[PDB]
Amino acid sequence: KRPKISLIGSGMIGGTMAYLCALKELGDVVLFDVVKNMPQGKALDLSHSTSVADTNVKVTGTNSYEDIKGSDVVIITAGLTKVPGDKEWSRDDLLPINAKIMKEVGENIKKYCPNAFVICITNPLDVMVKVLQEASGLPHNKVCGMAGVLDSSRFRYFIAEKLNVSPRDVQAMVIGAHGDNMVPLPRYVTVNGIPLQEFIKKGWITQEEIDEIVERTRNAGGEIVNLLGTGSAYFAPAASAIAMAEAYLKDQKRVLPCSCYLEGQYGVKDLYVGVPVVIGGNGVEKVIELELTPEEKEMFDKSIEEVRELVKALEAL
Amino acid sequence: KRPKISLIGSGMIGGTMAYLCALKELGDVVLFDVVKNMPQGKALDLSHSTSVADTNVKVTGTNSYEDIKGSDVVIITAGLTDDLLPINAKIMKEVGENIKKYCPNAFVICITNPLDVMVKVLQEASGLPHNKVCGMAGVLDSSRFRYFIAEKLNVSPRDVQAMVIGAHGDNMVPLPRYVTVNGIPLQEFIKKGWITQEEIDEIVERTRNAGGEIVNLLGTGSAYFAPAASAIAMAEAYLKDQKRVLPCSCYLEGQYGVKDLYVGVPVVIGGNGVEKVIELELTPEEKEMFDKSIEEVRELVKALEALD
Amino acid sequence: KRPKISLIGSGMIGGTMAYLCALKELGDVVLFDVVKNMPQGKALDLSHSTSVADTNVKVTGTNSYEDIKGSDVVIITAGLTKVPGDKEWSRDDLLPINAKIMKEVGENIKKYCPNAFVICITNPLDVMVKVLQEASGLPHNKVCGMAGVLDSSRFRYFIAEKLNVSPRDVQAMVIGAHGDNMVPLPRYVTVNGIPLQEFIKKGWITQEEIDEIVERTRNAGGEIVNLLGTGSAYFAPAASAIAMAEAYLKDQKRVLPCSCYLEGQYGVKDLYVGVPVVIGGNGVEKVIELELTPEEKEMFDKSIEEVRELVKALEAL
Amino acid sequence: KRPKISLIGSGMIGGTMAYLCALKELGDVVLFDVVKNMPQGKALDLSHSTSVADTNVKVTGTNSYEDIKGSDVVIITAGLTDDLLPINAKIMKEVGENIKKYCPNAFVICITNPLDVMVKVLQEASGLPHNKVCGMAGVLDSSRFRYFIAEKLNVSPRDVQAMVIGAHGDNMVPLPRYVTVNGIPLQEFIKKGWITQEEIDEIVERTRNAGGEIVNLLGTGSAYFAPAASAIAMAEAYLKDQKRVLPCSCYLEGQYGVKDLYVGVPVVIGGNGVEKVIELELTPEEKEMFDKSIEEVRELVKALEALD
Ligand SMILES: NC(=O)[C@@H]1C=CCN([C@@H]2O[C@H](COP(=O)(O)OP(=O)(O)OC[C@H]3O[C@@H](n4cnc5c(N)ncnc54)[C@H](O)[C@@H]3O)[C@@H](O)[C@H]2O)C1
Ligand SMILES: NC(=O)[C@@H]1C=CCN([C@@H]2O[C@H](COP(=O)(O)OP(=O)(O)OC[C@H]3O[C@@H](n4cnc5c(N)ncnc54)[C@H](O)[C@@H]3O)[C@@H](O)[C@H]2O)C1
């Protein structure tokens, strides 16, 4: 039988992700949402598009978790977003309400598709993937969060733009927690293996512009929201998560910064945070421990501790 | 120079089309919209997504018509969804004007409704060759027809040929007589038990109403995934000179009994636009449905010319 | 684990098929041949190409059947070709020698990958697929021959060329035995569902040109050989067979003329011959019984009987 | 008009390249060869294969140079594998002449060996801009280097960056110092136990010799799958203006200490050909290997100019 991909949450990101799954014939799709008839509407739109693409993909809409039975992969966008930010929204609403949805999603995964590879997108990302892992009981290797691939896609793009080379040939990474305490890694940026500093010396780019690109990367999500007025980014967020899903389903063994369960690496135990990892047919297969400078480890430590604060505040109740 | 694709209108359809242009590396994408900043917001999102796809596509958003200069393809969703007819026409008039000033060699694909009517306003206002302007509707209506037939037979939509002609709307005309499975007449599958004559009739009316069917289930807005894909397939056919056979709203000069009118019929789309009109051997009944389908189009086109 | 595709025979067709499998990331490939080191050379060439395509595909060369263990799909080009044609080659060499290789291939499939979907290309095609089925003991649904997709690709192309429309939008089919007694179906040719006769009346094509295209289709293989001097077609033959393999592995349910096991359909029992079929995740899933004219059934009967003659001559010894 | 890709030489590499052009719908393909009928035979085979891929690509074979008129890209494999140097040069002279007559705006990618030497003969004989002529070698040598490194680490080749510069041959110069895993220096993976310093050295010499390694195993002929893919990736970079960073044999005017010579170095390939040369910060040892690598090229280029 085909691979089964279930999208928990059928908003903008969920629909586009399902569009990519249909365009790439990655497998049968299931769009789930609490809103009645809505996932069923997109599914029929998307079903019609398969006709234009000359594919066979089955896309289904549903308001019941039962239809995620046997899913090979599960990708979760459901919950409140950051669009309101009201400075008390993250603390009084985002964190406490989303944690409760993650617990309900995790329980449904546990009963209906406990073998799936599970990719979380809901924010606060690092916190929510932990909660989803706890509630679902699945191996820590098969539950991770999408954040670094998106933050890296922005980083790489901004670099590629100034240098005027294809983004394929810009290697860039962003680690740490997803959010304002993310850590772009300017030292590790290369152009097809060439350190970026070589282009600084040859005048393709300058050091300040690089520092600007670091900050623009950290705020890229808000830059787009502000410009949209209504809504948030969904084209790149959806591709990033489907890159990770394609890496799992085709055992591509790609190297991508993802939010994953550490156990000693980087001096972190029993915690989810963004790090470079190898994604393969068996999920998160290897964590790469980068030889970070002391300064870099400091930014990583301050970012890893904000994640703790919130994991603990959530554990209060 | 890369091909340049300008999307006049950056709503749901326009943005979805821009994404397909970026995934398929069809060319540089310009997202135009009257709304301030919003196109630029989507453009940056889309730009980011090129890193994930490892492409080099340039996607820019703008609020100034000047940025469509030199466009090889223009795709128009600008409009709204009882003042809608004349307001959409002033828009379509304005869009068509900027096209002639800025990119008078573009292949233009109108999407806004009433499609077949607004197509002719656009051509008149832009003064472009009649074969370089057309409307996307038949590809989408056929993809629904094709899809519904495919799922009942349990074969791939690729091997279902099905077409829809006439005007885009509730009176569109699916053609069950021409449906085939890899060229095998659909009727052969009635006789061998794959589908019944009643289910075909039911499917034919579900195709007529699919637009509203989707609208009722979404609750806010209308379909756009298949709409976007249909427009891009038409643009891909022009950019790569694929000579595809597709139902599109095109300028007829006597074919089917229509003069100086844009109406949905099968055409060959290639590097020089709408390169050939296919004139089907329609039966009297089928020709009758076609005539009643376009009646509304011929009236509206006359009424709008009066209001100039 | 990835899907495993084994190519029995690593000649021109076998290598190209493996190139397509690598380009399309359809799965892990195994190139097998009796020639020592040769399949291993192509595999390393192809391995290098995956670097240019930015894929992860594992391509392996081998001279041992043991390495086809667990194959999801098996595609067989091995044996003598038609390139010599010496009028006694088909009878004294092609048929008797290839049948013996098919029996050895079938036995190796039976012991090492009895769950595979098996696509035969060796000629005489309809005869050899039967022999391979007998020797391997696998379900008749999971063993078929590639012939009609190639003969149809030629038919469709010749039509598309004269009309000057994309071949995608020309539906054309060829049924019967692969070879000189193949049956192009001019009546069933459509342009996106439109009968071809409509274009005859409107002057895009004429009836004689159509009849020429029927004959050119029947001789297309020899036309190319003659022009090549050395060798035979391998680009289209390889794609055709990989289309059938992609249809199985992705459960695409495509409609394609293939050589398959009939049991009453078309008044043929216990025999392999080319007919329109639906290929899906479970192999050959449905045979389509076309409402052929009496004339058409006559050409089909004369083509189905030449296949018998050879199946019986082979059964002598 | 579709892009026009002419392949001067229809052997194994040339035909494999034509197939990739047809699969990727990059443009119309012209297969030229001196051998009578053989190109036409492959063209018809390839044409048939377009039906299976559902593309509209035109593939023609010919024995007359006139059919390359207007080519946007030309890719040259014409040659043979102790008279081979001067015979290949008369050929490369002849090919370059017909190019200037027939398609003097083409992007030209030479493949025949000794690559870096025959590249300069071609440019001289064709009189084309030095940025519109280059040679494919570094992409292939890097794809082997990249591949060997990828399989030992068990990561995707996509996330291995590795380069090879200098001349194409046994003296080519892999650059283990610049190898990275998604930008992470390869040395970090020594320290954490993924690969050893000895296996890198071994890999670096296996890259040098991969060409012959393949040749020994095939028994007849040489590699062509990766060779073809590398040339097409370079042509795709030109046709779609992808601005790819790739090691190619390109005209240097003082970079690296080379004047009026074609040598393998990293470049940016885009819509205007070889748009930029990247000048790496090579160490003394690395610069030394580079100089010894091109010594043979500078001598042969001088010796062949004398024989005119
Ligand atoms: N022909 C078909 O089959 C398609 C099927 C589905 C719907 N398609 C029709 O085009 C649009 C549907 O596109 P979309 O779903 O994206 O509607 P949106 O509301 O999201 O976007 C409309 C945009 O159009 C922009 N726009 C852009 N320019 C203008 C001007 N110049 N005036 C007014 N509005 C303008 C405006 O800011 C809006 O953002 C509407 O007119 C439909 O009748 C037609
Ligand atoms: N630079 C690289 O890294 C490539 C790596 C692999 C091999 N590449 C070199 O080009 C070719 C390899 O291509 P191929 O594998 O296809 O060699 P073939 O023998 O199959 O084809 C050579 C064709 O070249 C044709 N040809 C075409 N034109 C001519 C002329 N004008 N003179 C002589 N020969 C000509 C001739 O008919 C032959 O069919 C040879 O010169 C190699 O040194 C180079």
Side-chain angles (χ1 to χ4, degrees):
Chain A
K1 207 176 314 314
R2 290 259 66 198
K4 183 165 178 179
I5 309 163
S6 286
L7 316 195
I8 306 300
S10 302
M12 294 310 313
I13 293 175
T16 46
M17 271 181 319
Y19 196 30
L20 292 169
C21 289
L23 287 173
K24 303 177 180 293
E25 221 180 302
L26 272 168
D28 288 347
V29 180
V30 170
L31 271 155
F32 169 93
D33 206 280
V34 299
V35 182
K36 313 84 174 195
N37 288 336
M38 188 275 270
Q40 292 83 351
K42 296 200 175 171
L44 242 183
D45 195 10
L46 287 157
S47 287
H48 305 151
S49 77
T50 75
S51 266
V52 180
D54 290 329
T55 59
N56 188 237
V57 180
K58 180 191 190 177
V59 186
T60 280
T62 188
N63 299 116
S64 292
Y65 289 98
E66 184 188 17
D67 292 308
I68 80 177
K69 193 115 185 154
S71 289
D72 295 274
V73 173
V74 185
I75 309 166
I76 294 139
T77 57
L80 314 180
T81 87
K82 321 166 219 175
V83 181
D86 185 1
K87 318 309 300 278
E88 293 54 53
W89 170 253
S90 97
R91 159 182 44 202
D92 305 337
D93 300 292
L94 185 67
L95 160 57
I97 280 295
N98 283 348
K100 296 178 177 255
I101 299 184
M102 300 279 78
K103 189 178 212 163
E104 202 192 44
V105 173
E107 280 180 273
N108 281 270
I109 285 155
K110 177 195 292 205
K111 181 177 123 184
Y112 284 132
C113 52
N115 288 131
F117 187 55
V118 181
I119 299 163
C120 177
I121 316 189
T122 299
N123 273 98
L125 188 269
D126 310 287
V127 173
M128 294 295 121
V129 58
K130 177 165 192 144
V131 182
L132 196 69
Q133 189 283 303
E134 269 174 3
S136 62
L138 309 182
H140 307 266
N141 287 3
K142 295 206 177 88
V143 182
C144 62
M146 185 295 292
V149 172
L150 174 71
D151 297 324
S152 303
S153 90
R154 283 145 179 185
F155 196 6
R156 288 167 60 209
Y157 166 79
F158 296 139
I159 293 296
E161 183 169 57
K162 180 47 166 129
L163 297 166
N164 198 14
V165 315
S166 154
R168 153 77 172 85
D169 291 328
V170 171
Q171 297 70 45
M173 283 183 306
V174 157
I175 61 176
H178 189 45
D180 276 286
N181 291 128
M182 66 166 70
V183 182
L185 294 179
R187 177 169 70 100
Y188 277 115
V189 168
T190 49
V191 187
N192 187 60
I194 310 179
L196 186 72
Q197 197 98 34
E198 304 212 7
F199 301 87
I200 307 184
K201 187 112 194 293
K202 292 255 153 40
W204 297 48
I205 200 177
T206 85
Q207 183 65 58
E208 42 266 37
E209 303 176 315
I210 291 165
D211 302 332
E212 286 185 87
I213 286 167
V214 179
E215 295 320 304
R216 184 177 199 187
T217 300
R218 168 175 8 262
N219 302 295
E223 187 180 3
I224 284 177
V225 167
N226 179 60
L227 281 157
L228 292 177
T230 84
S232 205
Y234 60 92
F235 282 116
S240 293
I242 294 300
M244 312 188 338
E246 197 161 3
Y248 172 87
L249 282 145
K250 297 191 186 195
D251 186 38
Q252 297 179 330
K253 311 231 179 284
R254 298 282 320 271
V255 180
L256 311 151
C258 301
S259 167
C260 321
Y261 191 75
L262 301 198
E263 283 149 289
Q265 301 92 324
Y266 297 89
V268 182
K269 262 168 110 202
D270 218 76
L271 206 82
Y272 274 91
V273 70
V275 293
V277 301
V278 164
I279 292 287
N282 300 310
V284 189
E285 287 169 345
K286 287 222 203 176
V287 175
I288 311 191
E289 198 158 355
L290 303 149
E291 289 179 31
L292 302 160
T293 62
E295 315 87 281
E296 287 169 11
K297 189 82 202 288
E298 198 69 53
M299 307 195 205
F300 185 100
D301 287 325
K302 309 212 198 302
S303 185
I304 191 76
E305 201 254 327
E306 188 50 271
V307 171
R308 276 204 187 86
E309 285 182 30
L310 282 45
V311 173
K312 297 189 219 168
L314 192 47
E315 276 176 314
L317 53 147
Chain B
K1 54 162 73 161
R2 283 262 70 195
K4 191 173 183 185
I5 302 170
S6 283
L7 311 166
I8 307 311
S10 305
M12 301 291 293
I13 292 179
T16 300
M17 292 196 299
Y19 193 24
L20 279 141
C21 291
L23 291 170
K24 298 171 170 292
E25 250 191 310
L26 282 181
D28 293 338
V29 185
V30 173
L31 280 169
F32 172 85
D33 205 282
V34 287
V35 181
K36 177 163 170 245
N37 288 134
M38 180 271 284
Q40 294 89 344
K42 288 180 180 182
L44 228 67
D45 190 9
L46 295 164
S47 284
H48 302 340
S49 80
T50 72
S51 285
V52 173
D54 289 326
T55 61
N56 187 40
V57 172
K58 204 230 306 192
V59 177
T60 72
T62 182
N63 301 127
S64 160
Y65 279 110
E66 199 166 23
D67 293 327
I68 82 186
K69 199 204 167 275
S71 292
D72 300 275
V73 178
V74 180
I75 311 190
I76 300 152
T77 58
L80 341 164
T81 61
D82 47 22
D83 212 330
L84 69 103
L85 264 297
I87 49 87
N88 270 358
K90 168 77 226 309
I91 292 166
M92 220 44 73
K93 184 184 75 190
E94 183 180 294
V95 167
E97 297 170 22
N98 291 263
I99 282 177
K100 199 45 161 184
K101 180 196 228 226
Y102 284 128
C103 48
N105 279 284
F107 189 57
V108 181
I109 301 165
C110 351
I111 318 185
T112 100
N113 302 17
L115 179 126
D116 305 279
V117 167
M118 314 305 297
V119 172
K120 179 160 198 328
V121 169
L122 181 66
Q123 190 286 309
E124 227 164 11
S126 81
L128 273 177
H130 291 263
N131 64 332
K132 296 291 282 297
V133 195
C134 71
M136 183 294 292
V139 174
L140 166 72
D141 294 319
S142 313
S143 85
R144 289 159 179 166
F145 197 11
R146 280 173 67 207
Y147 166 75
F148 294 133
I149 294 278
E151 69 155 346
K152 170 57 178 178
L153 292 170
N154 205 22
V155 303
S156 159
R158 155 73 177 82
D159 288 309
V160 182
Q161 296 69 65
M163 302 170 63
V164 163
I165 66 177
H168 186 63
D170 285 300
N171 271 43
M172 108 219 342
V173 175
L175 295 177
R177 171 165 82 85
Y178 283 110
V179 178
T180 61
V181 182
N182 195 37
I184 307 162
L186 179 52
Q187 184 87 46
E188 292 204 16
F189 294 82
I190 299 169
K191 197 182 213 152
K192 295 250 150 36
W194 294 50
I195 198 164
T196 83
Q197 181 64 59
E198 169 164 42
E199 299 167 313
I200 299 182
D201 299 6
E202 293 168 7
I203 287 185
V204 162
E205 265 60 51
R206 186 175 187 190
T207 304
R208 282 205 165 88
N209 295 295
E213 171 169 19
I214 289 172
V215 155
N216 288 342
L217 288 154
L218 290 168
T220 296
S222 44
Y224 51 93
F225 282 118
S230 300
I232 297 306
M234 284 165 50
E236 194 160 1
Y238 170 78
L239 301 181
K240 303 183 175 185
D241 185 28
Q242 310 184 318
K243 312 223 179 288
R244 290 301 302 277
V245 176
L246 313 161
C248 309
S249 194
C250 302
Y251 191 76
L252 301 188
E253 287 163 307
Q255 304 97 324
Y256 291 95
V258 192
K259 279 226 202 176
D260 197 24
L261 226 61
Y262 276 94
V263 176
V265 301
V267 295
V268 165
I269 296 199
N272 298 339
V274 186
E275 272 163 30
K276 299 211 203 152
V277 173
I278 298 180
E279 187 163 9
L280 290 154
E281 313 226 286
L282 283 165
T283 63
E285 313 87 281
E286 290 170 349
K287 183 78 180 67
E288 182 73 85
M289 303 197 242
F290 181 88
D291 292 311
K292 293 172 206 151
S293 198
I294 53 173
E295 221 299 304
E296 199 159 319
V297 166
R298 189 145 25 198
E299 282 195 34
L300 291 174
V301 169
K302 261 167 211 162
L304 284 172
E305 293 185 350
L307 302 179
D308 283 56
Chain C
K1 207 176 314 314
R2 290 259 66 198
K4 183 165 178 179
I5 309 163
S6 286
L7 316 195
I8 306 300
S10 302
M12 294 310 313
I13 293 175
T16 46
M17 271 181 319
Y19 196 30
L20 292 169
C21 289
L23 287 173
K24 303 177 180 293
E25 221 180 302
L26 272 168
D28 288 347
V29 180
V30 170
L31 271 156
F32 169 93
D33 206 280
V34 299
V35 182
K36 313 84 174 195
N37 288 336
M38 188 275 270
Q40 292 83 351
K42 296 200 175 171
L44 242 183
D45 195 10
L46 287 157
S47 287
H48 305 151
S49 77
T50 75
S51 266
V52 180
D54 290 329
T55 59
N56 188 237
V57 180
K58 180 191 190 177
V59 186
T60 280
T62 188
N63 299 116
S64 292
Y65 289 98
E66 184 188 17
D67 292 308
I68 80 177
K69 193 115 185 154
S71 289
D72 295 274
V73 173
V74 185
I75 309 166
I76 294 139
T77 57
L80 314 180
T81 87
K82 321 166 219 175
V83 181
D86 185 1
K87 318 309 300 278
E88 293 54 53
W89 170 253
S90 97
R91 159 182 44 202
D92 305 337
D93 300 292
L94 185 67
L95 160 57
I97 280 295
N98 283 348
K100 296 178 177 255
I101 299 184
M102 300 279 78
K103 189 178 212 163
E104 202 192 44
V105 173
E107 280 180 273
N108 281 270
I109 285 155
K110 177 195 292 205
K111 181 177 123 184
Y112 284 132
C113 52
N115 288 131
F117 187 55
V118 181
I119 299 163
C120 177
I121 316 189
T122 299
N123 273 98
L125 188 269
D126 310 287
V127 173
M128 294 295 121
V129 58
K130 177 165 192 144
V131 182
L132 196 69
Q133 189 283 303
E134 269 174 3
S136 62
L138 309 182
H140 307 266
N141 287 3
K142 295 206 177 88
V143 182
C144 62
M146 185 295 292
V149 172
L150 174 71
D151 297 324
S152 303
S153 90
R154 283 145 179 185
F155 196 6
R156 288 167 60 209
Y157 166 79
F158 296 139
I159 293 296
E161 183 169 57
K162 180 47 166 129
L163 297 166
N164 198 14
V165 315
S166 154
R168 153 77 172 85
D169 291 328
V170 171
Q171 297 70 45
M173 283 183 306
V174 157
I175 61 176
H178 189 45
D180 276 286
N181 291 128
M182 66 166 70
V183 182
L185 294 179
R187 177 169 70 100
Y188 277 115
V189 168
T190 49
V191 187
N192 187 60
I194 310 179
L196 186 72
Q197 197 98 34
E198 304 212 7
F199 301 87
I200 307 184
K201 187 112 194 293
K202 292 255 153 40
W204 297 48
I205 200 177
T206 85
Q207 183 65 58
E208 42 266 37
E209 303 176 315
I210 291 166
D211 302 332
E212 286 185 87
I213 286 167
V214 179
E215 295 320 304
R216 184 177 199 187
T217 300
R218 168 175 8 262
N219 302 295
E223 187 180 3
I224 284 177
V225 167
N226 179 60
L227 281 157
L228 292 177
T230 84
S232 205
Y234 60 92
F235 282 116
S240 293
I242 294 300
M244 312 188 338
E246 197 161 3
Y248 172 87
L249 282 145
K250 297 191 186 195
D251 186 38
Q252 297 179 330
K253 311 231 179 284
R254 298 282 320 271
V255 180
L256 311 151
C258 301
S259 167
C260 321
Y261 191 75
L262 301 198
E263 283 149 289
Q265 301 92 324
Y266 297 89
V268 182
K269 262 168 110 202
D270 218 76
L271 206 82
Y272 274 91
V273 70
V275 293
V277 301
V278 164
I279 292 287
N282 300 310
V284 189
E285 287 169 345
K286 287 222 203 176
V287 175
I288 311 191
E289 198 158 355
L290 303 149
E291 289 179 31
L292 302 160
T293 62
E295 315 87 281
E296 287 169 11
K297 189 82 202 288
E298 198 69 53
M299 307 195 205
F300 185 100
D301 287 325
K302 309 212 198 302
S303 185
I304 191 76
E305 201 254 327
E306 188 50 271
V307 171
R308 276 204 187 86
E309 285 182 30
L310 282 45
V311 173
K312 297 189 219 168
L314 192 47
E315 276 176 314
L317 53 147
Chain D
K1 54 162 73 161
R2 283 262 70 195
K4 191 173 183 185
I5 302 170
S6 283
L7 311 166
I8 307 311
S10 305
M12 301 291 293
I13 292 179
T16 300
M17 292 196 299
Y19 193 24
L20 279 141
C21 291
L23 291 170
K24 298 171 170 292
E25 250 191 310
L26 282 181
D28 293 338
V29 185
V30 173
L31 280 169
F32 172 85
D33 205 282
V34 287
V35 181
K36 177 163 170 245
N37 288 134
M38 180 271 284
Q40 294 89 344
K42 288 180 180 182
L44 228 67
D45 190 9
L46 295 164
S47 284
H48 302 340
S49 80
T50 72
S51 285
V52 173
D54 289 326
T55 61
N56 187 40
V57 172
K58 204 230 306 192
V59 177
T60 72
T62 182
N63 301 127
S64 160
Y65 279 110
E66 199 166 23
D67 293 327
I68 82 186
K69 199 204 167 275
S71 292
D72 300 275
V73 178
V74 180
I75 311 190
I76 300 152
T77 58
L80 341 164
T81 61
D82 47 22
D83 212 330
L84 69 103
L85 264 297
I87 49 87
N88 270 358
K90 168 77 226 309
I91 292 166
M92 220 44 73
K93 184 184 75 190
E94 183 180 294
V95 167
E97 297 170 22
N98 291 263
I99 282 177
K100 199 45 161 184
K101 180 196 228 226
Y102 284 128
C103 48
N105 279 284
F107 189 57
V108 181
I109 301 165
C110 351
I111 318 185
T112 100
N113 302 17
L115 179 126
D116 305 279
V117 167
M118 314 305 297
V119 172
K120 179 160 198 328
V121 169
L122 181 66
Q123 190 286 309
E124 227 164 11
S126 81
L128 273 177
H130 291 263
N131 64 332
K132 296 291 282 297
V133 195
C134 71
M136 183 294 292
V139 174
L140 166 72
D141 294 319
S142 313
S143 85
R144 289 159 179 166
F145 197 11
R146 280 173 67 207
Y147 166 75
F148 294 133
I149 294 278
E151 69 155 346
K152 170 57 178 178
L153 292 170
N154 205 22
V155 303
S156 159
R158 155 73 177 82
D159 288 309
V160 182
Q161 296 69 65
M163 302 170 63
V164 163
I165 66 177
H168 186 63
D170 285 300
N171 271 43
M172 108 219 342
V173 175
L175 295 177
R177 171 165 82 85
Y178 283 110
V179 178
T180 61
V181 182
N182 195 37
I184 307 162
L186 179 52
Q187 184 87 46
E188 292 204 16
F189 294 82
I190 299 169
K191 197 182 213 152
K192 295 250 150 36
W194 294 50
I195 198 164
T196 83
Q197 181 64 59
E198 169 164 42
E199 299 167 313
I200 299 182
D201 299 6
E202 293 168 7
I203 287 185
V204 162
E205 264 60 51
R206 186 175 187 190
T207 304
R208 282 205 165 88
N209 295 295
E213 171 169 19
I214 289 172
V215 155
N216 288 342
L217 288 154
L218 290 168
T220 296
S222 44
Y224 51 93
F225 282 118
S230 300
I232 297 306
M234 284 165 50
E236 194 160 1
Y238 170 78
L239 301 181
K240 303 183 175 185
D241 185 28
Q242 310 184 318
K243 312 223 179 288
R244 290 301 302 277
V245 176
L246 313 161
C248 309
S249 194
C250 302
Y251 191 76
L252 301 188
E253 287 163 307
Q255 304 97 324
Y256 291 95
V258 192
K259 279 226 202 176
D260 197 24
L261 226 61
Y262 276 94
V263 176
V265 301
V267 295
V268 165
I269 296 199
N272 298 339
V274 186
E275 272 163 30
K276 299 211 203 152
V277 173
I278 298 180
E279 187 163 9
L280 290 154
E281 313 226 286
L282 283 165
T283 63
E285 313 87 281
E286 290 170 349
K287 183 78 180 67
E288 182 73 85
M289 303 197 242
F290 181 88
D291 292 311
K292 293 172 206 151
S293 198
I294 53 173
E295 221 299 304
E296 199 159 319
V297 166
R298 189 145 25 198
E299 282 195 34
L300 291 174
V301 169
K302 261 167 211 162
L304 284 172
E305 293 185 350
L307 302 179
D308 283 56

